[PDB]
């Protein structure tokens, strides 16, 4: 068992390093490009910031995990980290959702809109997404305590609360984002197909990756969590093999999930020719 935890620790260290470097570079280039006459996008900067915060919080999780699931730090760290991580993760997911619809609208609706109006719209959307992410994340930390750091929900209906929270994490966390992103990237692909000039410059094998990496990142984790919750409901028989399999699956898929943090810079900005040229210039 300790072998698995050590392997996951190594993977986490690698992910932390890569994500930190990539997000820092992206943010720096985004800040500096505005002096060269470019028009950088607010969503990319906010997404980079959110990924940077999650990566910064990873080390606390690694330290807690290596310590045989013990929690040496106090309750203050419990609350602060479980709040920061959740807020940043939800913000990143919501920005990935909003970015697809913005990209699609850029080719049809915003073709003849002055830059000032679209800039104002983008700022409003960014503020709204940040506020919504914080509001959705707050309840989880609202009832988090340590004594083993975990959540102690109200007893009278404790059962419901569990599933309650889970539903949100699958309804507003992965279901709707995937639905919207897939639908709007398919529509964008169709719109590019309709035109002829755009075909030569752009490539249709990048949008498919955009819409598939989300699944590759967040489907195993959610299915594992749903299996765990169903097990906690005693629907599945209680067995040592089953509990061990669930534990291993949850840990490995959690480790895989954070790859979502370090794969955004490589997928949304690095492959962009203009960004690469600007980076080489800088």
């Amino acid at each position, epitope marked *: 068992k300790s072998v698995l935890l050590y392997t996951l620790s190594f993977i986490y260290i690698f992910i932390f390093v890569i994500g930190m470097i990539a997000n820092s570079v992206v943010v720096w280039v985004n800040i500096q490009a505005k002096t060269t006459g470019y028009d950088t996008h607010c969503y990319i900067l906010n997404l980079a910031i959110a990924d940077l915060w999650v990566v910064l919080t990873i080390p606390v999780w690694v330290v807690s995990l290596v310590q045989h699931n013990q929690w040496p730090m106090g309750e203050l760290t419990c609350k602060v980290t479980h709040l920061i991580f959740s807020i940043n993760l939800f913000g990143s997911i919501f920005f990935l959702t909003c970015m697809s619809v913005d990209r699609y609208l850029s*080719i049809t609706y915003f073709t003849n809109t002055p830059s000032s109006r679209k800039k104002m719209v983008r700022r409003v959307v960014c503020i709204l997404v940040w506020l919504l992410a914080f509001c959705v994340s707050l309840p989880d930390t609202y009832y988090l305590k340590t004594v083993y750091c975990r959540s102690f929900y109200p007893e009278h209906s404790i059962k419901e609360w569990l599933i309650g929270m889970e539903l949100v994490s699958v309804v507003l966390g992965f279901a709707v984002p995937f639905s919207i992103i897939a639908v709007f990237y398919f529509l964008l692909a169709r719109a590019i197909s309709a035109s002829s000039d755009q075909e030569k410059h752009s490539s249709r094998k990048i949008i498919f990756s955009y819409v598939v990496v989300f699944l590759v990142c967040w489907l195993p984790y959610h299915v594992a969590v749903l299996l765990d919750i169903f097990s906690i409901l005693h629907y599945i028989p209680f067995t040592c093999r089953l509990e061990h399999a669930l534990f291993t699956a949850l840990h490995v898929t959690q480790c895989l999930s954070l790859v979502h943090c370090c794969v955004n810079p490589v997928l949304y900005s690095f492959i962009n020719r203009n960004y690469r040229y600007e980076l080489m210039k800088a």
Partner: antibody
Amino acid sequence: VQLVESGGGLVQPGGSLRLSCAASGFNISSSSIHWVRQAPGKGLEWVASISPSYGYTSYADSVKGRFTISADTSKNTAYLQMNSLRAEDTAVYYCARVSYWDWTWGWSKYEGMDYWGQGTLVTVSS
Amino acid sequence: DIQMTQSPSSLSASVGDRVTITCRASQSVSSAVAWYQQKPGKAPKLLIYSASSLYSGVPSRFSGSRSGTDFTLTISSLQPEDFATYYCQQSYYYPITFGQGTKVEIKR
């Protein structure tokens, strides 16, 4: 990109006209179409602009409420209809394309008109 | 409407001399400017788009810059084919407003 205008010709004051800019070599719906006007021996001026996809049109002050700009994607064409023309509208009209590129959505630049058609004199003389 | 002043109104420089044309806005426009070139009785061409980018096709002589709300077009060597009015456009705020233009003419 081979934008070409049409129409134009002597018109009695207060009449009406419909200029047509018919594009080619690309789909009109992925770029906005503007109309620029040049008075005889003077600087350029802006008139109207249209996005063929959902039709969000913005007009200039001197033509507000008089000039209507429409688009037809079934033929890659834009039409500017003008009415109640005054003596001050004598000019030459070009149609320009504000090129938009998707392959640089993340890190773009403030685009500008790049492909202009030829003139079409509009002599509003009684 | 955003008023865009342009100077000098009329230039006079012999072949090979440098040239500099300045465009002053009214409010702040963030790099949303362009410079064209209208030959006598011909459709204007796009020389510079955005703050300083060069439209693919123009010679490297033409270049642009930015300073707050003041933009400038600089030409190193004034070739004989570069004598024609140059206009200044801003795209940030509609309606789009052009400049007066700065006719460049032979010297003797």
